[PDB]
Amino acid sequence: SKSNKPIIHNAISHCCLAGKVNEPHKNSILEELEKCDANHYIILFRDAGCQFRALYCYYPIYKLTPKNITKKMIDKLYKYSSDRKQFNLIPAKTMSVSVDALTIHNHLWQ
Amino acid sequence: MRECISIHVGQAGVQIGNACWELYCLEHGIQPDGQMPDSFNTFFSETGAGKHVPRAVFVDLEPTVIDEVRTGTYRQLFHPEQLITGKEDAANNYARGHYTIGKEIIDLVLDRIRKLADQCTGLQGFLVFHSFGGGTGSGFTSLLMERLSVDYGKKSKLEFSIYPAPQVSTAVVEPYNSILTTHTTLEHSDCAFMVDNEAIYDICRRNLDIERPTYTNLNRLISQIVSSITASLRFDGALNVDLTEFQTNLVPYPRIHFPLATYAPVISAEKAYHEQLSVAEITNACFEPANQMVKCDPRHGKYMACCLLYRGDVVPKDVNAAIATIKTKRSIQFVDWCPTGFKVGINYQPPTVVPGGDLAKVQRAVCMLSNTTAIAEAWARLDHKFDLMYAKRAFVHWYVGEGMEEGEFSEAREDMAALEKDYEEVGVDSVE
Amino acid sequence: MRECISIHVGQAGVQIGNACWELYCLEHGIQPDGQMPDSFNTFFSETGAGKHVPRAVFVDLEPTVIDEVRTGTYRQLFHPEQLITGKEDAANNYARGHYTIGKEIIDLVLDRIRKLADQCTGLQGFLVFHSFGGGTGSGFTSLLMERLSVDYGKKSKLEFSIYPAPQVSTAVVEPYNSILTTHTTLEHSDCAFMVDNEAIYDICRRNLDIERPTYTNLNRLISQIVSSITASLRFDGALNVDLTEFQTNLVPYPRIHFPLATYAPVISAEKAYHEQLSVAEITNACFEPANQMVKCDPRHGKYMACCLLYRGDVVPKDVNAAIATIKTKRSIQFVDWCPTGFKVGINYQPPTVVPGGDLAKVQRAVCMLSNTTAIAEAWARLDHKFDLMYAKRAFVHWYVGEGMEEGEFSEAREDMAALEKDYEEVGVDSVE
Amino acid sequence: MREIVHIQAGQCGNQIGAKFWEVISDEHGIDPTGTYHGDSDLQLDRISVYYNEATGGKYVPRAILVDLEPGTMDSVRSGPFGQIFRPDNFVFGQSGAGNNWAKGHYTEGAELVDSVLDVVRKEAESCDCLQGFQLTHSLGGGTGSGMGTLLISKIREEYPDRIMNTFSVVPSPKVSDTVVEPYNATLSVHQLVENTDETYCIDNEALYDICFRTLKLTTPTYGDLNHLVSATMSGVTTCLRFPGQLNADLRKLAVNMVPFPRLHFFMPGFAPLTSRGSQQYRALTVPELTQQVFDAKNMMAACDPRHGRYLTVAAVFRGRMSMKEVDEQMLNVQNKNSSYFVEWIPNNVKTAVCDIPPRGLKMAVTFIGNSTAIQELFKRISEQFTAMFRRKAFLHWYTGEGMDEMEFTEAESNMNDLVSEYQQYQDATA
Amino acid sequence: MREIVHIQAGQCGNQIGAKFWEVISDEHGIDPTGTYHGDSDLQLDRISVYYNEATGGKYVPRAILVDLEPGTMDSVRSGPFGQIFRPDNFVFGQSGAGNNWAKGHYTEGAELVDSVLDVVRKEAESCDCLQGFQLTHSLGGGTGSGMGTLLISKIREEYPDRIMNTFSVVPSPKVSDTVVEPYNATLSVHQLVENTDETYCIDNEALYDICFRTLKLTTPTYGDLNHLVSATMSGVTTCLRFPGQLNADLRKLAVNMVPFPRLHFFMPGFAPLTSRGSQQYRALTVPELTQQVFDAKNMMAACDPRHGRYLTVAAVFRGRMSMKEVDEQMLNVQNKNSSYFVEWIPNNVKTAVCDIPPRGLKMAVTFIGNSTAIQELFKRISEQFTAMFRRKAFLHWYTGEGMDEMEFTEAESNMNDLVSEYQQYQDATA
Ligand SMILES: CC(=O)O[C@H]1C(=O)[C@@]2(C)[C@H]([C@H](OC(=O)c3ccccc3)[C@]3(O)C[C@H](OC(=O)[C@H](O)[C@@H](NC(=O)c4ccccc4)c4ccccc4)C(C)=C1C3(C)C)[C@]1(OC(C)=O)CO[C@@H]1C[C@@H]2O
Ligand SMILES: Nc1nc2c(ncn2[C@@H]2O[C@H](COP(=O)(O)OP(=O)(O)OP(=O)(O)O)[C@@H](O)[C@H]2O)c(=O)[nH]1
Ligand SMILES: Nc1nc2c(ncn2[C@@H]2O[C@H](COP(=O)(O)OP(=O)(O)OP(=O)(O)O)[C@@H](O)[C@H]2O)c(=O)[nH]1
Ligand SMILES: Nc1nc2c(ncn2[C@@H]2O[C@H](COP(=O)(O)OP(=O)(O)O)[C@@H](O)[C@H]2O)c(=O)[nH]1
Ligand SMILES: Nc1nc2c(ncn2[C@@H]2O[C@H](COP(=O)(O)OP(=O)(O)O)[C@@H](O)[C@H]2O)c(=O)[nH]1
Ligand SMILES: [Mg+2]
Ligand SMILES: [Mg+2]
């Protein structure tokens, strides 16, 4: 029934990859989104400044482009408002349907 | 002392509570500023200066009905930290007040409660005011009742449900809310009062001689019911009652905990004369089928545990004589396994009339909280307002598209169809 | 007979110090002329006439912001020998405020300090007000802390370092100023206080109801934290603590000496009412993640040592009561090697308010100076704002061309990465 | 909060809008300049929902005005209540659609939609939290449907989770003001049942009979039709910006109303409707205003309510009144008309009571009806479509703009899907 | 202290400065005669940074005007604000460069620059502590391209450690206003990437469109383009001479900005940009002024910011405001635009807030951005150079003035070196 596929395509192609510098890089990930049937996609940044590095998906968590993650390595929760077109933070901590993106620890990158 | 705090979820809760905190300031000489020209420490926590503030968390997703509190007469009373607004309401959509929008601001709610439980050395219980109709009143209550009971567990939580009428409704998905806001808050709620709109419109017409009841007038009555359940904390009488004392008397089983209210005397100013309204006269104004403020037939079921809470000048001899007539009368029936099932209570304060209201200055009152069997057929009705809108699968496409499973609707009715037979478990007699 | 003196390096200090000595004159009746209509001799050395001059050496490479001091309200106060200006600024360049330009005027600075160490029979401490952001405040201090320590060695040297924010920065080479200016100060700093702008902007927004805070308004808050650390010299309460006493209580190791400050209560004129702000109420206002004036989550690390510099009418029974609550609470953690880690200080002065300000008139206050483990993650961040702007060798060419080696940057980082594990030295528990 | 961006397309909606903003200005005390002079503070308590406060204490309407030739815009900027708009927002082309649907969605729209959507994107960022996008157009013109169905195919991609209401003037049964308007409306329903949450089917033909019979008007100008449509257009969103006793808003007017994500074609009603001197003959009570509403002659859509059954009903009230009188009469007209209301929706009346009347009245009713009564409207146009396509007349003006016979059978298949689905949920009783 | 010497060269620069010193004299309250009549003492607190106070209380601008023919000077001296200059400093020749680069640097350059550098040597000695040498010329002429690249190769020898900003007008993509301006630029870029610390690349072509679209002008004269360029020209050094809350001078706007000793080409911007009547339609607050800056239509350089990425971005604000708004808005336009900003420069906004607005406004942003968006500006000119060198047309006016093919290949190799380095530090991610 429901999904998040029109939301993430609206979030990738218009917020963090909309510049024409990464326009070949946007096509290098857009064709890897049409070839999956996941009911819940999710985006993992590296910084609080939401630099895009990897695309994931959630089941009611595999690396579409760490491979698997748990509920311990999560720090912040981002919700992409289609109003402002900016990833807003989430006071809630449960990974749910409204949760559009998240961050992880700086231990995982050093 | 014995402190008790108040949460007003939804519009139907707050507009009652705008009249509720209009009413205790009448009973305690309190200015709208919080001034006044020491037993009342339970619904207040005063200042080092002379100013009392309530214990109120007026919480709402939409900002509209909140913004009239900050402009009304009672701006200068509430702490301006308390009144919680938000972006957009759930808008009669249960999957928005519990999953989408109420999930966002749930932590701002519980933390202001957290800064109110510290001031209370002897904290007693909660008074949540909500409906079953709206999306703010349903998804956000069942969100809130789950989180407070995990936080505390050992307190007393009292819902005040504006019950959905059998005949006169102002919503289209009002059966699709109530099965969700009873399944979820079945375990956490502890004594959920049912009050119906429809039977209040009768009592506005017949006993009050008013043909045009504004909601300014309907919520004076439910304010009088709330101001007499909690009349025994703010005042001391002869035979007092507490919020922990209700839940043992009125609730015979962990499932069935739905009392309903009845207040008396409800008469206009012109009919204050022409009768005398004795302590054994207003008691008969309770067990009629007329004044039962839920549209149910009390002669189509039994009373498990009635509960009388009088106030004003009542002499304790006369109650026992009044009760002894009633248990002998025939059409009034009690449950066979419950031998003698009353619970009296007398406070020393009369009800006081709000100026410009529509009740007479009476000398006594009674706020009956009876736990009948007659509400079972109304529970045998909202599933029939449920299934006719479910076999055609109508309106499912709004709940599903906001974070709700399709499989978690036949699960709720399965609990709700199980809740019907426990009322029928009451009516039978295990004959030896 | 106990005298402390103050230096104001860089722009960020001097603009703060314009509000500090604005605030000291409010607690003593000191005119802008130095007139007044005896324990305040700690920050003054008066003249044979009726005039007090402060113990302040305002130093700046750029001649700009000093000129507003010489024309401002406090023209008729400071000694014109104190106000040391210069020709050109370092201009956000550590290699200019330490090697090239600030090397020149350093003898004019140390000599005017030298003429203030002789008016003090009871010379106590230093106050270097500076930022980690600019080039003067980070370069000239690192020059100046080396020179006063070789001069004296045995005096307390408290800084007030503006910390660089994790999210909002008004400088581009700012992670190149900070990693240099901590390495240089680390042998010679004594107890370096941290303040961030970004965490004040929440406290300007939420607790104060100001959406437009000016640098008039941010520097009022950091002045009150300064005006309560130094309250136990100018006045006598029941429990006074000197600047020679902070360096032993707060500082567990010769490396880890970075407390972050917190002041409470901070509420507006309208929300000054509606609550009572007891000595057990304002204590819980300090240990929130909301009220920390450094943007670090304090629930991501343990408190090693706190220090609660109370003031106003605080009665010392309730402090022991309030602390006994806090050490028993769950989320607040103390370190397994520290048994109980507080240092209480009660003074007999209400925090007086500057007219034309935006804080309430309160009767008690608390200037928490709480060392922690939580600031270590921000040290795991400024090295990551460092390595990305250095693996591509950006911005090196302004520091090479002003007397700095290439190798003396990676020498600082590995010394700074060694400071990271010394907090991980704290976080472990050497069991058995 | 809950702001709304107002987009005006076609020749129809701009002349609607030029009277629409003439209506909203008198509810808030707004001069032609843009400043406040009203007498109630509630006019400014929610003034931000259609406005932006400019410097000096002026207000500008949040309204984007779309055309493809400067003919309509020149009339608006000349007239009163027309200079109040922002001159950046007048996004218009030059070449003219020429009442050609394929020209205003493929040819002329593809060079003007870019300079619309940035002006769209400018207005959205100046809001607190956005609620919806109200559009005002036809289903018969080329500009009001080619540019009309283009934006929702672009704005819903920019905004997947807001509400989109189109106040589409629907072609009439009797008079046909365009020879090819069966070809336009069949291509408009294909791009309104897929992307909009609700659609306000208003006709021209039954709009005169309300003017002639009930109102007793001699000469109905369009300045009296759009005068009347603007009443419903503002009456829906007076419960979002004024404190009612029982509040509704544009999301509450979606979940109450629409049982299936295709069947969302509404049809309004308004009351009181008097004459210049015949106001003495009646009383203004809620039992009177209710029975004026449910007549056959007050539904502005040109279809008989009795030929078919209702599903959901939202009678948004205005003015200061009581609540039982509402709740009695809404019950009263369901018991005597339970054959007209369908079986499988019990308590199918959404009451909404506000507290502010229209300017100068005492009360008002803004009915919103959702019925099976427009199954024959989509049996009307889809029959006018088919005979004009078996001979395929007027086809070389659409094929020449890049369009095939393959597309024209899909929209005919799409609308005949909608014929069966009103038919399916009309008699399905259990 | 911190005094700045102002050299002007070429026909272009000698008319910008006549508007530039027309601009400054209203900020400090200076008559055409040279005396003070203003109202604020802050006007005279730093009057000595562009002036010398002569006898009688007269002030004279520290400005040196250079030309090779007396045509442009005679316009300046006859006009207002022309007699205020020192008449010794009008150092000019008589031959005229004739829009010829090889004539104004090799032939006529050596016969006049001796009389220039002595005047430079005279003006520096009347200062307390010298700051820098701001300069105004083009990259298409013969005088402003040849005399200006002569001076900096001489003045840097006289001053190895002062800052050198040139406000160079850059040739346009569409209209080739000079037949051989692809030859003037590449010979001038050879002497700006090796001596100057910052070079303010301003185009004509994007400067016209702002006069048409945003400003709504019908007849844009050069007296309304240089009027606009001078607003940026004073906005950079209004923080060096006025007490700001966050002070920035010409050295702070060097080390914050310039990441590498070659990539130092800036492209400015300005806000607000109203119209004569459209000022009533907006709000003059920092959330508007920020988003007016980062449009494609506010960059005065003829290039798209969306093509290419930024590295470091300055924003010098004027007028009394608050710091949180600016700290919010500068934060805001990086999170929604994280694609446009480069990764390996975090916190890539430099901010400056001064306390004095422009004369008559409330607030104003003077933008200074650095980008990879000018790789194609040096891919445009480096291609117009190449096709005009294969057939080597228009060469016998340069070879005749002592110049070889050796120079025309090195400068072509010099500029394609810079094409690689805006490419090297654009995709280098880590
Ligand atoms: C002295 C006095 O009370 O005069 C009334 C009046 O006499 C009557 C007859 C009015 C009048 O309406 C008409 O004559 C009419 C003409 C053409 C089409 C429709 C109506 C009135 O013009 C219309 C007008 O309505 C309003 O002012 C509302 O705010 C209305 N505004 C407009 O329609 C409007 C008209 C011109 C310019 C701008 C706006 C409105 C209604 C719904 C939503 C928003 C606004 C009213 C009460 C009056 C007059 C002046 C005579 C009536 O209509 C309305 C819409 O109120 C017709 O029956 C009602 C009953 C009113 O009593
Ligand atoms: N007694 C009483 N009932 C009221 C009042 N206002 C509304 N109601 C009832 O509230 C029910 C509708 O649900 P509400 O609780 O008001 O809606 P909500 O909780 O605000 O949630 P939303 O859907 O988000 O608006 C109906 O049964 C109304 O009769 C009032 O003033 N008094
Ligand atoms: N709290 C606060 N911070 C300030 C104030 N003024 C400047 N700052 C901060 O100071 C930092 C920059 O340091 P500066 O002192 O201005 O620079 P500098 O050391 O003087 O050296 P220059 O680069 O030569 O000006 C930034 O992070 C500013 O936010 C102020 O009034 N209050
Ligand atoms: N209600 C109303 N209908 C109008 C008005 N103007 C035009 N129409 C109708 O709009 C239809 C013609 O469409 P139109 O919008 O002019 O063409 P377009 O400009 O290509 O969209 C016809 O059915 C007209 O009756 C008006 O002012 N009011
Ligand atoms: N902005 C601006 N550009 C000008 C002005 N005068 C000339 N130019 C430009 O300068 C270029 C011609 O160079 P010019 O300076 O006159 O030749 P030179 O005297 O040999 O340096 C062309 O690109 C003109 O557009 C002016 O007043 N303003
Ligand atoms: Mg609600
Ligand atoms: Mg400085």
Short mmCIF file of C-alpha atoms in Angstrom, two decimals, chain B residues 23-24 26-28 223-224 227-232 234-238 263-265 282 309-314 345-354 359-367:
data_model
loop_
_atom_site.label_atom_id
_atom_site.label_comp_id
_atom_site.label_asym_id
_atom_site.label_seq_id
_atom_site.Cartn_x
_atom_site.Cartn_y
_atom_site.Cartn_z
CA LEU B 23 -15.48 27.53 38.92
CA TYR B 24 -12.87 26.88 41.63
CA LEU B 26 -15.61 31.15 42.53
CA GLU B 27 -15.38 28.65 45.38
CA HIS B 28 -12.16 30.08 46.81
CA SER B 223 -18.09 21.63 35.65
CA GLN B 224 -20.54 21.02 38.50
CA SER B 227 -16.46 20.26 41.18
CA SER B 228 -18.25 17.70 43.31
CA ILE B 229 -16.14 14.64 42.64
CA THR B 230 -13.22 16.71 43.90
CA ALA B 231 -15.20 18.57 46.55
CA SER B 232 -13.90 16.29 49.28
CA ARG B 234 -10.73 20.95 48.83
CA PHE B 235 -13.17 20.79 51.74
CA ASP B 236 -13.65 18.58 54.77
CA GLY B 237 -17.07 17.20 55.60
CA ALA B 238 -18.26 14.36 57.82
CA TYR B 263 -26.27 15.45 38.92
CA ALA B 264 -29.24 16.83 40.83
CA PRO B 265 -30.91 19.34 41.41
CA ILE B 282 -33.26 14.85 45.19
CA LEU B 309 -21.61 12.06 46.73
CA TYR B 310 -23.79 14.60 48.41
CA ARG B 311 -22.82 18.10 49.40
CA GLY B 312 -24.22 20.95 51.38
CA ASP B 313 -26.41 20.57 54.44
CA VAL B 314 -27.30 16.86 54.57
CA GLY B 345 -20.21 10.78 50.93
CA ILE B 346 -21.04 14.13 52.47
CA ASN B 347 -19.15 17.37 52.12
CA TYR B 348 -19.95 20.45 54.17
CA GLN B 349 -20.07 22.82 51.28
CA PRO B 350 -23.07 23.71 49.15
CA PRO B 351 -22.68 24.11 45.41
CA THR B 352 -22.15 27.72 44.44
CA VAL B 353 -23.75 29.32 41.40
CA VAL B 354 -21.66 30.95 38.70
CA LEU B 359 -29.08 27.21 38.06
CA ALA B 360 -30.77 28.35 41.24
CA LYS B 361 -29.14 28.85 44.61
CA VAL B 362 -29.75 25.46 46.17
CA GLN B 363 -28.75 24.22 49.62
CA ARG B 364 -27.80 20.66 48.71
CA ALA B 365 -26.79 18.56 45.74
CA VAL B 366 -25.75 15.07 44.69
CA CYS B 367 -23.28 13.96 42.04
#
